[PDB]
Amino acid sequence: MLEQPYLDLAKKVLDEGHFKPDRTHTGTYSIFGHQMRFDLSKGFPLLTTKKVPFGLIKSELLWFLHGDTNIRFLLQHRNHIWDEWAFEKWVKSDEYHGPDMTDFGHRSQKDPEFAAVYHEEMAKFDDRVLHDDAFAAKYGDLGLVYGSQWRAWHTSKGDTIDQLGDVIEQIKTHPYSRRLIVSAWNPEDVPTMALPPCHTLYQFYVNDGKLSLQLYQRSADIFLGVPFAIASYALLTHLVAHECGLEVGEFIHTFGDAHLYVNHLDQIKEQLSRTPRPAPTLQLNPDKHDIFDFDMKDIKLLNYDPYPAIKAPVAV
Amino acid sequence: MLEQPYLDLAKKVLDEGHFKPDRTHTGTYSIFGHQMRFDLSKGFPLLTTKKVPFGLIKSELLWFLHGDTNIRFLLQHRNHIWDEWAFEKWVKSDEYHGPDMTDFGHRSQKDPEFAAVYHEEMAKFDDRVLHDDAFAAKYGDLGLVYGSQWRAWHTSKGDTIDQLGDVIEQIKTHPYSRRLIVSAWNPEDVPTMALPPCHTLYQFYVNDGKLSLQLYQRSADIFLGVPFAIASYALLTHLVAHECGLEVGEFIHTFGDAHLYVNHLDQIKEQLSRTPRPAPTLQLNPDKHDIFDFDMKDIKLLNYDPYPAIKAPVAV
Ligand SMILES: O=c1ccn([C@H]2C[C@H](O)[C@@H](COP(=O)(O)O)O2)c(=O)[nH]1
Numbered sequence: 147m148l149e150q151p152y153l154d155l156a157k158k159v160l161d162e163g164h165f166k167p168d169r170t171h172t173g174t175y176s177i178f179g180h181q182m183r184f185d186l187s188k189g190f191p192l193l194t195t196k197k198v199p200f201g202l203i204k205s206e207l208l209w210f211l212h213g214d215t216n217i218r219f220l221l222q223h224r225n226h227i228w229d230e231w232a233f234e235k236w237v238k239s240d241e242y243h244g245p246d247m248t249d250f251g252h253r254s255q256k257d258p259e260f261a262a263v264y265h266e267e268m269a270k271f272d273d274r275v276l277h278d279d280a281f282a283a284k285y286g287d288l289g290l291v292y293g294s295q296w297r298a299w300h301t302s303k304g305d306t307i308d309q310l311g312d313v314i315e316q317i318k319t320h321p322y323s324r325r326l327i328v329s330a331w332n333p334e335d336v337p338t339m340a341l342p343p344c345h346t347l348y349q350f351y352v353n354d355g356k357l358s359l360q361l362y363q364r365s366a367d368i369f370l371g372v373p374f375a376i377a378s379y380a381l382l383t384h385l386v387a388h389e390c391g392l393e394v395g396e397f398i399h400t401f402g403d404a405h406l407y408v409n410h411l412d413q414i415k416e417q418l419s420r421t422p423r424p425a426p427t428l429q430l431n432p433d434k435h436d437i438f439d440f441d442m443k444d445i446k447l448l449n450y451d452p453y454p455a456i457k458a459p460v461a462v
Numbered sequence: 463m464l465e466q467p468y469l470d471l472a473k474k475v476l477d478e479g480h481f482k483p484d485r486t487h488t489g490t491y492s493i494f495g496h497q498m499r500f501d502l503s504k505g506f507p508l509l510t511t512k513k514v515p516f517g518l519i520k521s522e523l524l525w526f527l528h529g530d531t532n533i534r535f536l537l538q539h540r541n542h543i544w545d546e547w548a549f550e551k552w553v554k555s556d557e558y559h560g561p562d563m564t565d566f567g568h569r570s571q572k573d574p575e576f577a578a579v580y581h582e583e584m585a586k587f588d589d590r591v592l593h594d595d596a597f598a599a600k601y602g603d604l605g606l607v608y609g610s611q612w613r614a615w616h617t618s619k620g621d622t623i624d625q626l627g628d629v630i631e632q633i634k635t636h637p638y639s640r641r642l643i644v645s646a647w648n649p650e651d652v653p654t655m656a657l658p659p660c661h662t663l664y665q666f667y668v669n670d671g672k673l674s675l676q677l678y679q680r681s682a683d684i685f686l687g688v689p690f691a692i693a694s695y696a697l698l699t700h701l702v703a704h705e706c707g708l709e710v711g712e713f714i715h716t717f718g719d720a721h722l723y724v725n726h727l728d729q730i731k732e733q734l735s736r737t738p739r740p741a742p743t744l745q746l747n748p749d750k751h752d753i754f755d756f757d758m759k760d761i762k763l764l765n766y767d768p769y770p771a772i773k774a775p776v777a778v
């Protein structure tokens with residue numbers, strides 16, 4: 147079954163995984179150096195052993211493909227995966243004349259009343275982002291996010307580079323090149339970034355008329371983040387291929403620090419007691435070819451029949 | 463035996479490797495996505511199934527660790543691995559009033575007389591680099607090479623960053639960090655680089671008092687280049703550890719395009735008919751701790767007993 151490598155990766159970390167402390171002071175079981183491989187021709191690797199919200203992955207990826215870094219678009223899509231990131235800028239700024247919010251995310255875990263307060267302050271921030279056009283320009287622009295890294299790398303000459311755009315053109319004219327790389331890691335920015343890109347870099351490759359992509363992820367939360375990263379980048383591999391008029395090959399996930407948070411152990415064994423069902427099918431709009439122009443409605447997911455979702459706390 | 467993963471990698475490409483054309487118009491057998499793993503505690507992964515010149519690897523790595531980009535140092539060390547790179551700048555410049563040299567490297571293969579002529583023009587260029595101090599500053603500085611990438615990344619503000627230096631300090635103060643990354647890939651420079659860095663990026667990791675390093679190499683010549691890359695980076699893993707007062711763990715080599723040039727096939731089967739002997743031992747100077755200050759004499763290699771070297775043409 148297609149998602150087997152993920153179950154394997156999970157089972158493995160439980161077994162060979164040595165305990166290792168981390169940034170967020172939660173404990174983790176970690177393995178360093180691991181690579182898995184999905185044959186995107188057998189189906190779409192969206193986990194069927196626990197429900198993954200394809201809509202979130204889809205609207206996020208498009209945001210990236212638009213070289214966009216503002217939350218307004220995700221909000222317009224009911225997506226809030228990046229709220230806290232913009233919200234935290236809002237709270238540390240001169241305008242935020244509201245209640246206590248320092249360390250909001252962590253405190254939410256054991257709220258004194260905090261939860262409903264935080265959840266409402268967010269409802270405020272978000273609505274304003276969506277409406278106060280000037281508010282959005284200030285507290286809704288995350289700045290250096292995958293979108294600006296893939297499609298607007300700032301150079302030492304005050305200019306901007308579209309790595310992805312260029313790489314697509316390369317695939318079109320020199321498909322056998324070994325330099326089809328897009329990077330998210332900028333030495334200059336990581337020293338003061340809130341969250342240095344985990345999805346550090348990826349590489350395209352073509353052969354036998356099929357396109358492959360290898361992602362190198364520096365750090366991966368096996369339970370929460372990995373299921374999404376497999377889905378984001380496999381979708382990318384389809385889009386880019388559909389654009390270059392190529393067939394889809396394999397998606398290859400390489401890890402630096404693959405870990406399983408100590409508070410996730412029960413949930414993961416829970417998942418490992420399930421049997422995968424056949425993998426869904428991705429159906430892309432045949433009329434559209436400029437992936438940069440793709441819309442939510444141009445990407446269909448057929449035959450997705452997953453097991454109920456598993457709930458677990460975001461370790462911080 | 464320690465070098466087994468390399469023999470495995472080679473044998474594999476012969477088998478699963480699909481033919482794929484490339485830049486240099488030589489044909490290659492290629493596989494995309496592969497990772498191997500050497501336990502640096504069992505010994506040093508310098509191949510014993512064919513003699514690898516440790517001296518070349520050693521003097522090169524130091525050059526890198528010095529944030530140096532000039533050929534003068536390698537020349538002072540009998541190392542010429544980077545000559546053609548500086549030499550080619552020399553020939554395309556106003557001063558080079560000499561014989562035909564356009565495409566010199568390729569033409570050398572089937573010389574009309576070219577070989578001895580080229581080999582002498584080089585003897586000239588090199589001697590001048592070593593002596594004409596001003597000549598060196600002009601045609602001996604490669605510019606953007608691993609040394610300037612690891613230890614002097616130019617920022618958008620006309621400044622310079624010492625990625626490696628910083629990463630070492632990080633290891634010292636936050637050994638459990640998942641952000642111990644040094645990058646060689648600069649989006650701005652690759653569009654006009656002669657040879658974009660193959661050894662694209664590496665990641666440090668610490669746990670149980672042992673240091674590990676994972677290299678991500680975009681493209682790898684299995685026969686010629688891989689044996690060296692395994693040796694360079696494993697040596698790095700030892701140096702950095704000796705500096706941070708840690709034990710050495712594993713070296714992990716991940717590949718993008720692992721290939722075996724069509725003109726190397728006989729030589730590689732030749733090598734695969736040999737049996738590995740026990741792996742050598744690396745002995746580092748105990749008095750010295752600042753790896754940035756290491757000298758050729760501070761690195762000893764004990765028990766190196768290899769099979770005769772195998773000769774093969776540099777495919778271009
Ligand atoms: O696809 C993704 C994106 C993010 N994260 C996680 C990785 C880390 O667990 C956490 C960031 O912690 P640091 O590695 O930066 O310290 O976010 C994932 O697991 N998968």
Ligand SMILES: O=c1ccn([C@H]2C[C@H](O)[C@@H](COP(=O)(O)O)O2)c(=O)[nH]1
Binds near residue numbers: 485657658682690
């Ligand atoms: O450790 C190393 C350094 C360089 N090369 C090779 C990789 C490629 O075969 C060639 C450069 O060709 P491109 O990939 O840049 O097209 O140099 C290696 O094999 N190993």
